[PDB]
Amino acid sequence: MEAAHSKTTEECLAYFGVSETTGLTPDQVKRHLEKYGHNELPAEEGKSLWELVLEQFEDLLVRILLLAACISFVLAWFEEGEETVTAFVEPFVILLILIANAIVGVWQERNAENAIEALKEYEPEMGKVYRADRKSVQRIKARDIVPGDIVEVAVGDKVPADIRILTIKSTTLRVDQSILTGESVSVIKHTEPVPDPRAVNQDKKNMLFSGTNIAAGKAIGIVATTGVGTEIGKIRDQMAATEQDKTPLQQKLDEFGEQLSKVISLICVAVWLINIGHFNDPVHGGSWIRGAIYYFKIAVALAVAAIPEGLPAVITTCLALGTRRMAKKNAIVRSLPSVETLGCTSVICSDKTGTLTTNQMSVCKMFIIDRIDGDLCLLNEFSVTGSTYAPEGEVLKNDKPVRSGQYDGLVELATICALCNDSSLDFNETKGIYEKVGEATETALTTLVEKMNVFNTEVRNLSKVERANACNSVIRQLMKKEFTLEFSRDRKSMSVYCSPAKSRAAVGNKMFVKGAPEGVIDRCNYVRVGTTRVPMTGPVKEKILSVIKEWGTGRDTLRCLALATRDTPPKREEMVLDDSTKFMEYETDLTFVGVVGMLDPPRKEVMGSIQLCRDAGIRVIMITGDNKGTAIAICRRIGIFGENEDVADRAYTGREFDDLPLAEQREACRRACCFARVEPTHKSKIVEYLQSFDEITAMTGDGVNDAPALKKAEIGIAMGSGTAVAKTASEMVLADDNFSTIVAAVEEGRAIYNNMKQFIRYLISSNVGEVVCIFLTAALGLPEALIPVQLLWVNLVTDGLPATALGFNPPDLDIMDRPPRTPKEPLISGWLFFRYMAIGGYVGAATVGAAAWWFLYAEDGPHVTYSQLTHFMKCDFEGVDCEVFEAPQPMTMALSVLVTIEMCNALNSLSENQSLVRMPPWVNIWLVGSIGLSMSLHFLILYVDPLPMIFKLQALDLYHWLMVLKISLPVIGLDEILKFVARNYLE
Ligand SMILES: Nc1ncnc2c1ncn2[C@@H]1O[C@H](COP(=O)(O)OP(=O)(O)CP(=O)(O)O)[C@@H](O)[C@H]1O
Ligand SMILES: [Ca+2]
Ligand SMILES: [Ca+2]
Ligand SMILES: [K+]
Ligand SMILES: [Mg+2]
């Protein structure tokens, strides 16, 4: 880790004593490693403070409860009398429910963070280095690179460690450093140094920082420093950590929380004033104050009982739960809002190569010209065996094993593939498998060149390592690659300028081009036949294109490329290299050589996932830069279209899409499910259109040309084996490239919603009748139904654990067989309000009808024969009874029925509109236990003598209880009825 960039190329190569072309010797590596250590970080310590997490105490509400707990603590203190045992209890009953949800949050929160870390501890980062033990680049675990050895980076790659740029192989090099500095834009770089020693990161345009991605280009440089010395390792924790705020569903719910904070605020202040007549009253110390005060409590307590203190805590929990379950499916959630959003995704756009397919390419069919005679064009089509990148396979013609070098046309075909290629193979001894280094497509051609071996290079006895690139190196050792005109989506082809070694064909300089067949074929005026050349003709050009199409729409839906070569390139001088736009011109007046057909197998889980998406109401769109024929073919075989379904206007190409007027483009986007040969920004535009219909859309990519779209989309989904550039722009990464998970994600995203909607229904319909209880008893002639503590109780027993458990609710019956939720759909439909009201009604008038019941019809206390003796003012009002109006017997019956009916109401929230018969309590084994935990806690307060006085008098076991269930249970049938109205009816 030499402390500088200041010095130039030579000083760093010399500082570590290494050749840029060979790189460290296995010995040096041993040394530098012991000396400098493993290039990693202690970072493996991220684990939020034991308590840092216990911050379930910050949401809007809850603070309310904490406040109410304060005023309860001050009142309970001063308040004199035979109290204290009931005065000081109130506060704990208010924060005990907070403590309860607090835990559940912290717990399901730890497990989440805990699983997200294991997802990363699986699949270590890799880097490409140049070591002396191998002639060609080799990939090693990044933790194993050390300062000094040569390293190679390129488009999409994530910079493995701080590096002094020694040389830029491409005609330009840009990179994304925003993560470190801030500068949101491809920043340029160059070889020379900059005098300023301890200068600011943002200036060193001769470095690459560990953690930044390469925007465009390819460069080789020497590791200036690793480990913590990294200008990203020291500036590690210092980052203020930009953890975005709440998610769209939380902002939606936190707002709906204060919407009640208001309504409730009224209910309470109101319930308060609608007293007074009892302020100066007897029962209240006889004073107006004690009377007013007692009622501020009836309000305060009523609030703390109506404010869903478990709402914020639940969204949180449920979310971390989604994350944890995605992690389990090897899916990395990089953004909290993902799952919830996929849940209501109307359309899923997806890249083809890599995303929809395995990207495991191999050349299986290839052809050159055999002979030409008039309108008849004979092609020499060969077949190749070997589906991996292994340099083991044979070239067959008429199914007989041929000597590829026998055909001059195949020699050139091989020459072109080897020289016009920025990739290579690397033998991974650990798995004994040949791996690619660079873009799949190109690598495929490298393995091909190895299989052809047009120069019969003796390779029977070479190391599995030395074999990997043997044949290629030979073609390279025979042609000097002057410069290469980088590949660009505009012209869809790449070129390379080569000079003969020791000048064989004299100054015979050539340009070897390879690209999308159509464009390359169009830029060909000559055809090569053996060593000969002839002008391109109508019958030949059609023949060449016919076989390609045959290959692209068949069983094998091959991916194809044309190989051509400019025999007489422009004078090296008249060519400018800092403007891609000019390159297509340089690649003209070409000579067609041949074509190669690659196998690129669709991922097995795709078709299935595509199907389920249909059922879910998800539209699936394929966007690619590949040939439309190959595209539509692949789309049929994947499930986007039917095997013989006409697609005249549901499949377009870049050109076609652009020829359409703005108005139609948008329509084409809602109609088409396949866009091919799309230009650069087309993927993004296509996501904009779908968003201009107010549709939650998602993009799925693997490479850099997906970044834009991935960011534009509401949800970006990236592939684990894709580039870091796409992964960055993405909000989720399928670590294992399992397309199915996306569907699993959208499902969990929906469940998470329904759950919140159920938690709300319960929490609401209950609490409504809860207050409906007061505004029907405290204003209908009946005596007080409950008192302070008695409210803080039901609260702590029906708004706590049993509700939060609704978060661990299973996915509804046909949740993933119903169309996506409109981005505008209201949180609570109107009928839903009726549903809450009806239930709120009954529960509210079966809690009051249970108090009166006792006084009347009940075989206890008075009997005031159906009339309650009309009023309460009796202090001969019949005077056949004492003051049974201040009896506890009646309240206990009230408090207990409210509680029981609420838990009964809870069982009505396992699903929105589903008969308990189909989805029984045991679908959510947690809700059950929770219920019991609350139920048991009730009995204890009801019968364990020390407690009863603090609350009320023990409702006679049996009879009294039987009466509770006889009026509570109906709530379960009442809503069960409401459900039958929406299920088997309404729709
Ligand atoms: N490295 C390369 N050199 C020469 N030609 C290439 C090339 N990579 C791709 N091509 C050609 O250019 C075409 C367009 O490339 P582009 O990246 O836009 O789409 P693609 O099919 O290569 C990847 P995707 O299907 O995931 O969008 C490719 O289909 C191929 O015909
Ligand atoms: Ca409450
Ligand atoms: Ca309640
Ligand atoms: K995005
Ligand atoms: Mg791709």
From Swiss-Prot:
PROSITE patterns: ATPASE_E1_E2 (PS00154). Keywords: ATP-binding, Calcium, Calcium transport, Disulfide bond, Endoplasmic reticulum, Ion transport, Magnesium, Membrane, Metal-binding, Nucleotide-binding, Phosphoprotein, Sarcoplasmic reticulum, Translocase, Transmembrane, Transmembrane helix, Transport. Ca(2+) 2 binds at residues 767, 770, 798-799, 902. Disulfide bonds join 875-882. The chain crosses the membrane at residues 49-69, 90-110, 254-273, 296-313, 757-776, 787-807, 828-850, 892-911, 925-943, 959-979. Residues 70-89, 274-295, 777-786, 851-891, 944-958 are lumenal. Gene3D superfamilies: Calcium-transporting ATPase, cytoplasmic domain N (3.40.1110.10), Calcium-transporting ATPase, cytoplasmic transduction domain A (2.70.150.10), Calcium-transporting ATPase, transmembrane domain (1.20.1110.10), HAD superfamily/HAD-like (3.40.50.1000). Mg(2+) binds at residues 351, 353, 702. Ca(2+) 1 binds at residues 304-305, 307, 309, 795, 799. Its EC number is 7.2.2.10. It is a multi-pass membrane protein. The active site is at 351 (4-aspartylphosphate intermediate). Residues 1-48, 111-253, 314-756, 808-827, 912-924, 980-987 are cytoplasmic. GO terms for molecular function: ATP binding; ATP hydrolysis activity; metal ion binding; P-type calcium transporter activity. Residues 787-807, 926-937 are annotated as: Interaction with PLN. GO terms for cellular component: membrane; sarcoplasmic reticulum membrane. Its cofactor is Mg(2+). Its main location: endoplasmic reticulum. It is found in: Endoplasmic reticulum membrane; Sarcoplasmic reticulum membrane. Belongs to the cation transport ATPase (P-type) (TC 3.A.3) family. Type IIA subfamily. Interacts with sarcolipin (SLN). Interacts with phospholamban (PLN). Interacts with myoregulin (MRLN). Interacts with DWORF. Interacts with VMP1. This is Sarcoplasmic/endoplasmic reticulum calcium ATPase 1. It comes from Bos taurus (Bovine). The gene is ATP2A1.
